[PDB]
Structures are given as structure tokens and as C-alpha cells.
Design a protein around this motif. Structure first.
Motif, PDB file in Angstrom:
ATOM      1  N   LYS A 155       0.843  -1.248   0.000  1.00 51.20           N
ATOM      2  CA  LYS A 155       0.000   0.000   0.000  1.00 51.20           C
ATOM      3  C   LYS A 155       0.843   1.248   0.000  1.00 51.20           C
ATOM      4  O   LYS A 155       0.463   2.290  -0.691  1.00 51.20           O
ATOM      5  CB  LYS A 155      -0.911   0.034   1.252  1.00 51.20           C
ATOM      6  N   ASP A 156       1.942   1.225   0.797  1.00 51.67           N
ATOM      7  CA  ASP A 156       2.762   2.420   1.007  1.00 51.67           C
ATOM      8  C   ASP A 156       4.125   2.111   0.385  1.00 51.67           C
ATOM      9  O   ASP A 156       4.804   1.147   0.809  1.00 51.67           O
ATOM     10  CB  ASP A 156       2.928   2.702   2.498  1.00 51.67           C
ATOM     11  N   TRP A 157       4.527   2.881  -0.607  1.00 52.20           N
ATOM     12  CA  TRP A 157       5.812   2.692  -1.306  1.00 52.20           C
ATOM     13  C   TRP A 157       6.880   3.562  -0.784  1.00 52.20           C
ATOM     14  O   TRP A 157       7.995   3.586  -1.388  1.00 52.20           O
ATOM     15  CB  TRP A 157       5.619   2.927  -2.816  1.00 52.20           C
ATOM     16  N   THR A 158       6.686   4.308   0.308  1.00 52.63           N
ATOM     17  CA  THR A 158       7.636   5.221   0.789  1.00 52.63           C
ATOM     18  C   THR A 158       9.013   4.558   1.071  1.00 52.63           C
ATOM     19  O   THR A 158      10.034   5.122   0.821  1.00 52.63           O
ATOM     20  CB  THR A 158       7.175   5.813   2.176  1.00 52.63           C
ATOM     21  N   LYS A 159       8.941   3.338   1.640  1.00 51.00           N
ATOM     22  CA  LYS A 159      10.189   2.544   2.033  1.00 51.00           C
ATOM     23  C   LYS A 159      10.395   1.417   1.060  1.00 51.00           C
ATOM     24  O   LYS A 159      11.083   0.443   1.485  1.00 51.00           O
ATOM     25  CB  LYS A 159      10.060   2.111   3.510  1.00 51.00           C
ATOM     26  N   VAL A 160       9.964   1.519  -0.155  1.00 53.27           N
ATOM     27  CA  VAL A 160      10.291   0.505  -1.179  1.00 53.27           C
ATOM     28  C   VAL A 160      11.205   1.146  -2.160  1.00 53.27           C
ATOM     29  O   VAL A 160      11.059   2.356  -2.521  1.00 53.27           O
ATOM     30  CB  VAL A 160       9.048   0.029  -1.875  1.00 53.27           C
ATOM     31  N   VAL A 161      12.213   0.369  -2.632  1.00 55.16           N
ATOM     32  CA  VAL A 161      13.060   0.719  -3.778  1.00 55.16           C
ATOM     33  C   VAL A 161      12.864  -0.392  -4.761  1.00 55.16           C
ATOM     34  O   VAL A 161      12.941  -1.591  -4.360  1.00 55.16           O
ATOM     35  CB  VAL A 161      14.521   0.876  -3.357  1.00 55.16           C
ATOM     36  N   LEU A 162      12.510  -0.114  -6.019  1.00 56.76           N
ATOM     37  CA  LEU A 162      12.275  -1.123  -7.007  1.00 56.76           C
ATOM     38  C   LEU A 162      13.556  -1.397  -7.769  1.00 56.76           C
ATOM     39  O   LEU A 162      14.110  -0.423  -8.335  1.00 56.76           O
ATOM     40  CB  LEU A 162      11.157  -0.644  -7.955  1.00 56.76           C
ATOM     41  N   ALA A 163      14.033  -2.623  -7.844  1.00 53.64           N
ATOM     42  CA  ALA A 163      15.275  -2.929  -8.562  1.00 53.64           C
ATOM     43  C   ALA A 163      14.973  -3.793  -9.771  1.00 53.64           C
ATOM     44  O   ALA A 163      14.378  -4.869  -9.659  1.00 53.64           O
ATOM     45  CB  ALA A 163      16.227  -3.680  -7.630  1.00 53.64           C
ATOM     46  N   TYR A 164      15.347  -3.314 -10.941  1.00 58.08           N
ATOM     47  CA  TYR A 164      15.201  -4.058 -12.173  1.00 58.08           C
ATOM     48  C   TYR A 164      16.472  -4.827 -12.495  1.00 58.08           C
ATOM     49  O   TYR A 164      17.542  -4.209 -12.688  1.00 58.08           O
ATOM     50  CB  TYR A 164      14.863  -3.142 -13.356  1.00 58.08           C
ATOM     51  N   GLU A 165      16.356  -6.098 -12.597  1.00 56.13           N
ATOM     52  CA  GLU A 165      17.485  -6.991 -13.021  1.00 56.13           C
ATOM     53  C   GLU A 165      17.223  -7.507 -14.410  1.00 56.13           C
ATOM     54  O   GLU A 165      16.307  -8.233 -14.647  1.00 56.13           O
ATOM     55  CB  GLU A 165      17.546  -8.175 -12.082  1.00 56.13           C
TER      56      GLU A 165
END
Lengths: 254, 254
Positions: A155-165
């Protein structure tokens, strides 16, 4: 987007007591620009030593995995609750090596993520398609499914980092260009704008987890939608990793 | 057989910094008889603290798992080489929770074991059949297959401890009696005499990993072919775990 620019060092399954001590001393000798977030992810057994000896001014800790739920009868696993209580701020989840060797499905990664976020961690959530999937014309289908699972749980993306491999360019004999990397990151950005809203998408760090070195980091860091890196083997060489952290330029800025 | 009598405490996925410190202090307050080997197995992140604070006179460390091979690109995993270099002497491999939740096959457990032994660890190698398997009249078939895989990989049993888990009596509402435990341990002993030779089989510790507490430990420890325990939840209560270690009686003796 932005940013802060974010660089994570995934040590993978590497280390010895002497080598970890040496790497920590090399990292501590490095200078990092203001306004870059840098995280380093040792194997579990070293986290105590690293947390105690690595400069907190410059670096935060991450784990390389966590269990899908809380404490209990899960021999061999480390929970997100344990990590938070230990003082670790971040975890990597869904790395391509775990999706493949450990069969972590899209749903498992997403549930690990939501559980970790509820336990108080930040999450470096990893996605990416293989060479077979890119060969078959399935790049969108695969990335959309990986992301749809994450959006269903988070729900909350504040503490997410999305990593593309770009797993098509990891151990296959294929190189990914910066242009190929940016094409995916631009796709991911627009997907996230649509699913999460443009304000969330603009603030979300989408970091590149293909083979990142001190040689190619500035060519990558200048791409519009690349907000940092999830570094593999270069993270084991202190000065090279610090150079990657210095690739931020204007994306730091602070 | 013998022995030394051997007691391992598998903490499973449990702990906090405060609880681990308290448990270590409770363990350090306990008295253990001469000639019993006692091993305690924290989650990976606590191994450093425990190794530094737990009385080495009384206890050795174990990990709860290790990777199937050496160092490399295996995000989230800890290798046997890392554990040996860290100073950890033991590892638990093939626990029922990993055979089931992580799909570790008979062959994977066996290869993990041989790899760990070649890296310098001792191994608590776990086997055991489920309620479905016992219902179907497959107890011998399943245990023989689990053991045949281990025998195919392992040459030297000097640093192996075999742990039998009655998984039919773990979370099913079924209790295993000491007589039921001994029946399996006697089967395993004769199997090992046939496959390894009577001298190896007589010296091999075959420990019981069903639900072991301070209440039932002496009823179990008196059984002819039970050489110790792989303790689960009771290992989290210091005085109860120390009582289990004191169940050795004449199997210590030293």
C-alpha cells in the motif's frame, strides 16, 4: 523521477572474516557525496560485525533475504522482525537468484515485501525477465505480472526501492546497453504512474541491477529513469563500489 | 551404540536481541555433566553474539542450514566455508521444516552434507517420515531412501550425527512414545550396520528429534538406540534445555 540516488551493494554469498574486515576498512576510507543513500548487504552471519565497524555516516545495512512471515518453526530462516530488532533497516527481496534457485514466485516475493514493510524494514524489491522471456516476446507480460503482484500487496511505497534486473544479460553472454536499461526503467515508471499515481511514481527509486561496475556506472546513472544501482560483484571491491556511489551527480544532489 | 551423548538445541526462527541475551545467560548458569556434547543453533544473525558470550566449556555452536556449495552468486545463502571460517563447528541439514517448506530433496540434503563435511563442519543430518507416509505403510521405504542418499554422499561418518524426526508426531495431534522412537532408532542402527559396518554404526550417534522436553527426556534417553536429542521449542527455555542435557546418565558417561 527522483531520488535520493540509491546504491545498494549485494555481497551475495561471499565473505570470510578477514575479507569482510578488509572490505569494511576500504568502504570506510571512501568518500560518498551528500544526498546519496548507500546500503550494503552482507551474508547474515556478518551483519553484526559490519553494523559495528562500518561508518554509519556513509552506509546503512541490509539483509539479502527474509522469511515470508514472523518467528516460528522455520529452521534456517531469519525473520523481518528479527532484522528490525537487530537494527537492520533494509532487506533485498525477490532477487533473481532466489526467484530461480529457490522458486520464489511473484506472490511469495510480494508477500515477503508486505510482511517486511509491516515489520518496519525498507525493501529493495527485485524484478526482471530472463533471456527466454525476452526471446519469446514476453518482456511486458512478465514485468507486468511481477509488478501486479507487488502492487496487490504493498500500500505504502515510501520505504520501497524497485530494482530491475535484466536477467537476460546476467550469465548469458549478452550485455545490456544503457539504452536498453533505460527503455525498461521508462516502462516501469509509466506502469507505476498508472497503478500508483504520478506522485508516487515520481518519488519511487527505480534502480538498475544489471552488471554495474566502476566502468559503466556513469553511462547508466545519466539515464532519465535510473535512480541508482543494485550492485553485484563490484560491491566486493571497496574503491570500485565507492566510485559507483559517486556516479549520482545531480541525482543526489542532496 | 555409543556416544558421547549428544544434545542439540535448535532455536528455529526465534529470537530478539534481548531474548537471546537472556537465553545465553540462562544457559551459562546451567551445569552440564562431563562427557555430553551440547550444541546450540541460533538464527544466523545471532551466531556472532552467541559465540562471544556463551560458555565454550559447556556449549558449541551450530548453524541451522547452509548452502549446497561454495561461495558465489547465491543471494541470501550462507556457505559451509563461511561457517567454518567463522569458527562454527556444526550445521543442521535436512531438517523436516526445510525438506517440506523449501523442497529439499533427499539428494539435496545428502549433497549439502558432503559439501559441509568437506568444508570442515560436523553435520547433524536429519531424516524422518510424515503421517501420510506412516499411514501408507511406507516408513521403511522412506527412511531407507533418505539414508541411501546420505550413504551415497558421505564416506566418513566421524563428524556426522544422525537425527530422526518423527514428522508423523510433529503438528499432527499424534504423540510418539519412547517405544515407537526406539523402534525406529533400532531400525536405523541395523541399517547403518549393514551399509557402513558394525564398528561405524556402533559409534554413530542417532539422536531423537521428536518433541523432546524436560518432562519426557529421561524416558527417551534410556532407550537403547537413542543417543541424544535434537530439541526444538524447549531449547528456548534455558533451564529446561539444561535438564535435557542432564538426561544422559550413563551415556555420557564421559
Amino acid at each position: 523521477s527522483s531520488a535520493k540516488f540509491f546504491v545498494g551493494g549485494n555481497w551475495k554469498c561471499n565473505g570470510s572474516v578477514a575479507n569482510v574486515a578488509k572490505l569494511v576498512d576500504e568502504l570506510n576510507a571512501g568518500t560518498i557525496p551528500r544526498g546519496v543513500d548507500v546500503v550494503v548487504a552482507p551474508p547474515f552471519i556478518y551483519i553484526d560485525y559490519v553494523m559495528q565497524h562500518l561508518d554509519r555516516d556513509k552506509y546503512q545495512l541490509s539483509a539479502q533475504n527474509a522469511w515470508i512471515g514472523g518467528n516460528g518453526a522455520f529452521t534456517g530462516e531469519v525473520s523481518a522482525e528479527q532484522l528490525t530488532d537487530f537494527g537492520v533497516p533494509w532487506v533485498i527481496l525477490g532477487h533473481s537468484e532466489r526467484r530461480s534457485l529457490f522458486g520464489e514466485s511473484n506472490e511469495v516475493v510480494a508477500k515477503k515485501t508486505s510482511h517486511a514493510l509491516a515489520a518496519g524494514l525498507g525493501v529493495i524489491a527485485c524484478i526482471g525477465e530472463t533471456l527466454e522471456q525476452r526471446n519469446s516476446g514476453s518482456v511486458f507480460k512478465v514485468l507486468d505480472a511481477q509488478m501486479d503482484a507487488l502492487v496487490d500487496e504493498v500500500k505504502d511505497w515510501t520505504k520501497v526501492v524497485l530494482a530491475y534486473e535484466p536477467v537476460w544479460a546476467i550469465g548469458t553472454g549478452v550485455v545490456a546497453s544503457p539504452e536498453q536499461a533505460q527503455e525498461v526503467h521508462a516502462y516501469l515508471r509509466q506502469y507505476c504512474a498508472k497503478k500508483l499515481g504520478a506522485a508516487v511514481a515520481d518519488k519511487l527509486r527505480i534502480i538498475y541491477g544489471g552488471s554495474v561496475s566502476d566502468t559503466n556506472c556513469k553511462d547508466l546513472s545519466k539515464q532519465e529513469d535510473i535512480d541508482g544501482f543494485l550492485v553485484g560483484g563490484a560491491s566486493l571491491k571497496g574503491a570500485a563500489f565507492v566510485t559507483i556511489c559517486n556516479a549520482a551527480g545531480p541525482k543526489a544532489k542532496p
